[PDB]
Amino acid sequence: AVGACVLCNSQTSLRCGACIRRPFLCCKCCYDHVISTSHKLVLSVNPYVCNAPGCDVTDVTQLYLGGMSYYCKSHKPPISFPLCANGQVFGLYKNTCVGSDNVTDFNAIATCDWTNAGDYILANTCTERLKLFAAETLKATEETFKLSYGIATVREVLSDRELHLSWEVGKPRPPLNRNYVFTGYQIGEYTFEKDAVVYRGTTTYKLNVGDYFVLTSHTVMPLSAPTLVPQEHYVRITGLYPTLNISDEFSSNVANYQKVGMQKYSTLQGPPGTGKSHFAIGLALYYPSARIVYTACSHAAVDALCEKALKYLPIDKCSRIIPARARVECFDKFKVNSTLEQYVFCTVNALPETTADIVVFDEISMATNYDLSVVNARLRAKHYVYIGDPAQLPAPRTLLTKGTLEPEYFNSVCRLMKTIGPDMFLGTCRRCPAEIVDTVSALVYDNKLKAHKDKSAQCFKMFYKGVITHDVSSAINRPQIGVVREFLTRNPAWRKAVFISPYNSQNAVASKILGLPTQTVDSSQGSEYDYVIFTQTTETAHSCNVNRFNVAITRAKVGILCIMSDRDLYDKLQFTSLEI
Numbered sequence: 001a002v003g004a005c006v007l008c009n010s011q012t013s014l015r016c017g018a019c020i021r022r023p024f025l026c027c028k029c030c031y032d033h034v035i036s037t038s039h040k041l042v043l044s045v046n047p048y049v050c051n052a053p054g055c056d057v058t059d060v061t062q063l064y065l066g067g068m069s070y071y072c073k074s075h076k077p078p079i080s081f082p083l084c085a086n087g088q089v090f091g092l093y094k095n096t097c098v099g100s101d102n103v104t105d106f107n108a109i110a111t112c113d114w115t116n117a118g119d120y121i122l123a124n125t126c127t128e129r130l131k132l133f134a135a136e137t138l139k140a141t142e143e144t145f146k147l148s149y150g151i152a153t154v155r156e157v158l159s160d161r162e163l164h165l166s167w168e169v170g171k172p173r174p175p176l177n178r179n180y181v182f183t184g185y186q187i188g189e190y191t192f193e194k195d196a197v198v199y200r201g202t203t204t205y206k207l208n209v210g211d212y213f214v215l216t217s218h219t220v221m222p223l224s225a226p227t228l229v230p231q232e233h234y235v236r237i238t239g240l241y242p243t244l245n246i247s248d249e250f251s252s253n254v255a256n257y258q259k260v261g262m263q264k265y266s267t268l269q270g271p272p273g274t275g276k277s278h279f280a281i282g283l284a285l286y287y288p289s290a291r292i293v294y295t296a297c298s299h300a301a302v303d304a305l306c307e308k309a310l311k312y313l314p315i316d317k318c319s320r321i322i323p324a325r326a327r328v329e330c331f332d333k334f335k336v337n338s339t340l341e342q343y344v345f346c347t348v349n350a351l352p353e354t355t356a357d358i359v360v361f362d363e364i365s366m367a368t369n370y371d372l373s374v375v376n377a378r379l380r381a382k383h384y385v386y387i388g389d390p391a392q393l394p395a396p397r398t399l400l401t402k403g404t405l406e407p408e409y410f411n412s413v414c415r416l417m418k419t420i421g422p423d424m425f426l427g428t429c430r431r432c433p434a435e436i437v438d439t440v441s442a443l444v445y446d447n448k449l450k451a452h453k454d455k456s457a458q459c460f461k462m463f464y465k466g467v468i469t470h471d472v473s474s475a476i477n478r479p480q481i482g483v484v485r486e487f488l489t490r491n492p493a494w495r496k497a498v499f500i501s502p503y504n505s506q507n508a509v510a511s512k513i514l515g516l517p518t519q520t521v522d523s524s525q526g527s528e529y530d531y532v533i534f535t536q537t538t539e540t541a542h543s544c545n546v547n548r549f550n551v552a553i554t555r556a557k558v559g560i561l562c563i564m565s566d567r568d569l570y571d572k573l574q575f576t577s578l579e580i
């Protein structure tokens with residue numbers, strides 16, 4: 001019942017009983033909270049509630065200290081004092097309290113519902129202590145809301161991959177995509193796609209009628225470590241030992257590797273195809289005796305670093321850390337769960353508590369402030385390297401419905417990269433034809449991204465609005481897909497292209513009609529393909545977001561066809577226009 005104030009670190013015996021996280025607040029900060037919000041329940045060693053029989057007064061502003069007990073105005077003894085007085089709520093340490101001038105920001109964080117983009121803006125521009133409080137509060141709210149979705153029970157099993165579901169009446173249904181993972185009853189985790197529903201299970205299990213699926217929730221632990229440790233700048237390389245014979249394949253990053261060793265943490269912005277994994281793995285080659293923990297949010301990102309390390313690092317010194325409660329198939333070519341190896345590859349959620357000379361945290365645009373705090377709490381390192389690109393996509397915020405979240409507010413690292421700039425920048429795209437490079441360089445990179453490749457003359461655009469149908473909220477554009485079918489009859493080298501759309505439902509229609517592999521933009525992040533076919537599908541904030549569009553067109557190595565709905569983005573594509 002005694003702790004440190006979330007706003008000013010002062011010792012206190014008070015917590016707000018109305019905030020979902022029950023934060024400690026000192027006598028001064030607690031006053032500013034209760035006098036300006038609906039939160040009136042104050043918790044101490046004992047709760048601040050009227051102590052007379054039958055009384056239900058719990059509003060601290062209507063409560064008084066009589067002796068050592070609390071009473072309302074109708075029950076207080078003649079010798080009593082108001083609990084709220086002199087800008088202070090009575091509690092222990094009433095004279096050491098410092099107070100804070102940021103309580104207004106606390107009050108907004110503590111009372112918002114996380115549906116507006118301004119809640120996330122405030123969560124990223126406040127003090128460091130408030131950032132943790134907002135991250136914890138948001139995550140709890142997100143987790144509790146998962147209880148709002150209905151239960152799904154199998155009515156019949158059509159095949160090994162299709163079934164008919166029964167949805168609980170009185171509650172909304174979750175969208176059926178690869179981001180919504182249900183737990184079956186425990187017969188493993190399942191995902192559903194679109195009355196027949198396509199089901200994918202962790203193991204091939206004989207599903208029965210009556211088995212049910214529940215959205216996988218999770219308890220939310222408190223945070224203690226900052227999103228970023230305080231910065232330090234050193235006179236020379238600290239804790240690391242450079243080689244003298246780094247191969248020329250990695251020598252262009254030597255100066256950047258030196259800078260990594262001169263500061264506590266450093267940020268690297270790497271636009272698509274500019275060599276992020278190459279940078280990350282070369283860091284180990286330049287500091288060959290360093291213990292390096294490579295981490296990121298998704299298994300796919302960690303597995304991509306593993307594939308890179310397999311080519312260049314000693315395999316006997318690598319371990320992939322896979323949580324015992326297995327879920328998906330991870331990289332399998334390293335020793336598994338040998339936490340003490342020199343090179344450890346692990347998703348954030350599964351990080352062991354250990355130390356390292358260097359922590360590399362990849363795909364930083366996808367991280368949240370909760371992730372960044374978890375990484376600092378579990379990994380004590382001499383150097384932290386944050387790799388990513390704030391012009392790519394963030395983690396979906398399931399509660400946000402009003403307003404768009406700009407890159408500067410994705411997390412603390414993206415905020416630094418957007419405000420003061422990244423410590424390092426990989427400036428040459430080696431993956432994409434120059435038509436793409438030139439488009440995105442002007443679109444999101446202030447013309448700072450250079451093309452190494454020539455124009456391919458296989459980059460095409462077509463302006464075709466089509467017809468927009470919907471499966472709930474996921475959009476479909478059958479005319480746009482018909483145009484693609486026509487294109488394929490006349491361009492047989494594209495038979496091997498990957499279809500990309502901003503919508504799962506569109507992708508599903510394309511799979512059946514066109515026969516091509518399909519991917520959503522968001523799931524295509526970190527991937528590359530020779531030929532890509534993109535159908536914008538609709539003109540929405542989702543389909544026109546510049547970060548998503550950047551990602552979409554930068555997956556292609558040789559050629560891309562973009563069937564567009566928005567005039568602005570169509571015009572900016574530096575491609576050859578196709579007729580019809």
Ligand SMILES: Nc1ncnc2c1ncn2[C@@H]1O[C@H](COP(=O)(O)OP(=O)(O)OP(=O)(O)O)[C@@H](O)[C@H]1O
Pocket residue numbers: 238239240241289
């Ligand atoms: N790979 C290495 N090559 C050469 N000398 C090394 C190497 N690793 C450690 N040493 C030496 O051994 C000492 C003790 O190692 P230790 O790991 O405890 O220190 P350190 O954390 O790297 O030190 P500092 O941060 O002051 O550089 C180092 O300070 C350094 O002088």
Ligand SMILES: Nc1ncnc2c1ncn2[C@@H]1O[C@H](COP(=O)(O)OP(=O)(O)OP(=O)(O)O)[C@@H](O)[C@H]1O
Pocket residue numbers: 249250251252253270271272273274275276277278279308430431528
């Ligand atoms: N600094 C560099 N110097 C020389 N060649 C490089 C450099 N960075 C990357 N390359 C070349 O580009 C190839 C691909 O790099 P990488 O594995 O990082 O993937 P990418 O798709 O280009 O980039 P990213 O991971 O940023 O999307 C490397 O295998 C290497 O041949």
Ligand SMILES: [Zn+2]
Pocket residue numbers: 016017018019033039110
């Ligand atoms: Zn409160």
Ligand SMILES: [Zn+2]
Pocket residue numbers: 005006007008009010025026027028029030098099100
């Ligand atoms: Zn305080």
Ligand SMILES: [Zn+2]
Pocket residue numbers: 050051052055056057071072073074075
């Ligand atoms: Zn009373």
